[PDB]
Design a protein around this ligand. Sequence first.
Ligand code: HEM
Ligand code: HEM
Ligand SMILES: CC(C)(C)OC(=O)N[C@H](CS[C@H](Cc1ccccc1)C(=O)NCCc1ccncc1)Cc1ccccc1
Ligand SMILES: CC(C)(C)OC(=O)N[C@H](CS[C@H](Cc1ccccc1)C(=O)NCCc1ccncc1)Cc1ccccc1
Lengths: 442, 442
Amino acid sequence: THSHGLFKKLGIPGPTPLPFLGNILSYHKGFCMFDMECHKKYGKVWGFYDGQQPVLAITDPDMIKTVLVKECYSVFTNRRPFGPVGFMKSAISIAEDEEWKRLRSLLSPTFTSGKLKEMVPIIAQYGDVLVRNLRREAETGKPVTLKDVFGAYSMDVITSTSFGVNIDSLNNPQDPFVENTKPFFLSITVFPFLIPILEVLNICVFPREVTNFLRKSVKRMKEDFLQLMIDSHKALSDLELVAQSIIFIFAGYETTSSVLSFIMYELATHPDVQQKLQEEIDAVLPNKAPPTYDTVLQMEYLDMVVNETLRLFPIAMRLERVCKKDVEINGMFIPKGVVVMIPSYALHRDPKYWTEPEKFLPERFSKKNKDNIDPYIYTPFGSGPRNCIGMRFALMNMKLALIRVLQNFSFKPCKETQIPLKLSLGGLLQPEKPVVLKVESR
Amino acid sequence: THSHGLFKKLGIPGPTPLPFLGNILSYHKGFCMFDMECHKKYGKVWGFYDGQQPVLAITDPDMIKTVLVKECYSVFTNRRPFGPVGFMKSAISIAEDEEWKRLRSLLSPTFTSGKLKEMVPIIAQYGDVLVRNLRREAETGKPVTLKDVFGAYSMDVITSTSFGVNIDSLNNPQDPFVENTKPFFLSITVFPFLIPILEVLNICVFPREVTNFLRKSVKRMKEDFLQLMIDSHKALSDLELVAQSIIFIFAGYETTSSVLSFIMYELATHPDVQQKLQEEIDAVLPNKAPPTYDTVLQMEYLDMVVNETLRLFPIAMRLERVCKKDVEINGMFIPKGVVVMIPSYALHRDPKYWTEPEKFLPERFSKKNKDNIDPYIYTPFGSGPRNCIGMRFALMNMKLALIRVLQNFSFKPCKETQIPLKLSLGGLLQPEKPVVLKVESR
Ligand code: HEM
Ligand code: HEM
Ligand SMILES: CC(C)(C)OC(=O)N[C@H](CS[C@H](Cc1ccccc1)C(=O)NCCc1ccncc1)Cc1ccccc1
Ligand SMILES: CC(C)(C)OC(=O)N[C@H](CS[C@H](Cc1ccccc1)C(=O)NCCc1ccncc1)Cc1ccccc1
């Protein structure tokens, strides 16, 4: 408990922690409800304990910019430790300090405007596979699971954008890594001292059978992101090369299909926005013209729909940085070892910044009203040197999928559609019941 | 084993490590013999594994200066992690990086030339208690255990030099902390991942009964080193104050009596040096004059005796620094996490630097021959910003004890004297059998 007197000493308010457990019993309603409740109880700053780990939550936009941007390289360089990872310690999202800096610098030129412009005529293929597979499940009066057909699409994109492997994600044969994307973490906070125990037993969060399903696949491409790695600080090792491919597969698959599912739920439960977005798509792309890089960046209402959905459902929920040494940001002492946390979900739904924050209103992001939005309150991709490096790629992939789908189909709520949607009362930001909707062909 | 291929990759030679154990089975002859053997087998540089921890030994004087002095603050700032320590993490010899820098800067003015000059007329008291207690055990024909009566003296000095507590160390009553100075570490190298487990069970290397024998004693002196702490970077906390007192007690007690025991063994087994040193003491201090600060610094042969003994018996044996990031010192790549080690015992007995290194010859340190001695080969107190901060104090205390003792007594080997002396085939640099000698009154 000796560390549970930290916030009491610093005069920082917060819920009283129980011995050993801290405040983790409050996660029984999920991180999000616990964050919004503390935001209401304690105000701009509060602390709690993930077991013995003190966590200081900050909501001041200036203080948030200081942590994420101004003092990132010096004090707030790394995220909360995560284990056991095995060789995934060399992953960019996990790597720390100097190893992270080397990985970030040599992986940043992967998501430039030029590299993304090269991937657009390639992603267009699986948009048609997405429509034709949707055409089958839609031509029959059978409600459709979005994250299934969206997940099949998201799989198709990430294998080719970074490597070159092309598969219709209903081939169902030799190289689906569904084994890769296939509660013990509750003990990570109670037993973070057991991370060193498990890191010597080869225990990873995914088994060694999967992380060799692709480890060999990388070597056969001695014969895109895979290319750019062997093309390029000390050069990329062959195993580091492997670890970043894994990070991109998780990111490009789980985030894409999940956000697209939240988007289509919003359009179905708001028929006006769906019709308005369908009008804009028909105007920029008449005769169902194929979307391109520049035409995707021309659709303003499409971007307003995407941003507003990301406000309601920020899949990260929280942004975190480890305070690597004593600091005093914006007039507040922060001792070493404290985990600094930014409650993105809570700030995205704060009534003090958003009128009717529970309502889905894309007009918040109109160029008339977008200016009234603080970039350090709305942070769906983070901020600063450790923001989402695949942000521009993620937006481009999702919009290309929406354009081609809304060009051919309309979406209505079915009898089994969960309205209003329940968020997963568990850890990662997902819905409780999967999203199902009726699909009609235009 | 995955880390056991490190030195094989780097082309660095060394003994082949067994799985899990590494090369720790070779410590069965002690660190010293293993170091000297590797020095002979592999030359200037070699590596081995304390379990899964790679340890690179360097013997090049330039490379040693680079580690200890030139690149100390930047790369080689901390020692090998030590556990479990409890609150002793705040101890200066244990503390790391910025916390160490703050502790070093605010504790350095304790061992100045001026502060040491103030402690000399106080240490002179227990030199007489040392003689009178020696006078009893010497007036009777009963061989004497040095580390007993030296340990009683060393205890007397450290309590007063830093606090003000005066005790005849044969009072045997209320405040002897023999409980403080009262094989499980073999598992520290095989289970360094268990250090985080034990650090939450309040398990220290000394029990909580002892580390509260003095924790309360510090507070009663709200009512010397204890004074200088409350007098003084953020100021010294009250518990940090406590932790450095503990470090000084261990250092000032165990090192002092052990070195003095090795010294008196050398003088007894070399009657010429003992007579020559007794002559010099009688010349600087005629009529058995009391030794002072300046008169102690005038005796050259006394310093030659002390330095040569420290060459044969460097109680640290090894100097270590943790490589905190990839470096290339003197043209050799050193990857992050590697523990850099300097085998002081091996270098002090290297025939390539010392003619007849096993022989006790104080004339190596005559001002005629001292110049031929490399300060990065002979490092009894370390070097650089993390050298022994109590070096000047340790030399002064031991010399004041030797002067007063050699002024009144001569020392002859007894029937039970271990000749030649056997070093403890175990961990810390001690003799196997305790040192006993005959004592005659002058
Ligand atoms: C809707 C889609 C996505 C969202 C909302 C999202 C959001 C985020 C957020 C909030 C962070 C943490 C930022 C911070 O801590 O300041 C992050 C990190 C990251 N994201 Fe994304 N992400 C998405 C998709 C992707 C994709 C497709 C990739 C493909 C490579 C990707 C790669 C990464 C990486 C590598 C990091 C860690 C960067 C670093 O630590 O240097 N993300 N993302
Ligand atoms: C014959 C007596 C002594 C010898 C040979 C000795 C030797 C050493 C050595 C070799 C080191 C490590 C240096 C390095 O790693 O570069 C050290 C560190 C240290 N010694 Fe001594 N020591 C002696 C007595 C003392 C005494 C009496 C004190 C009293 C305070 C003391 C306090 C310290 C401290 C605090 C450190 C750690 C310094 C730091 O890490 O900043 N030592 N000693
Ligand atoms: C400390 C705390 C738990 C609070 O948070 C995290 O560490 N949780 C994730 C967990 S690892 C995951 C992939 C993985 C999994 C096992 C081993 C190696 C690698 C990843 O790499 N990304 C997750 C999705 C995602 C990516 C990119 N963009 C957006 C979303 C890591 C993470 C990293 C950045 C932001 C949020 C979460
Ligand atoms: C990593 C490795 C084991 C190879 O080495 C070390 O850590 N072993 C010692 C161990 S802790 C000891 C006191 C203590 C003990 C338990 C908890 C807290 C504190 C200390 O503080 N000093 C030991 C004597 C001494 C001091 C001062 N001067 C000369 C000799 C630490 C140490 C530090 C510097 C140099 C050598 C050894």
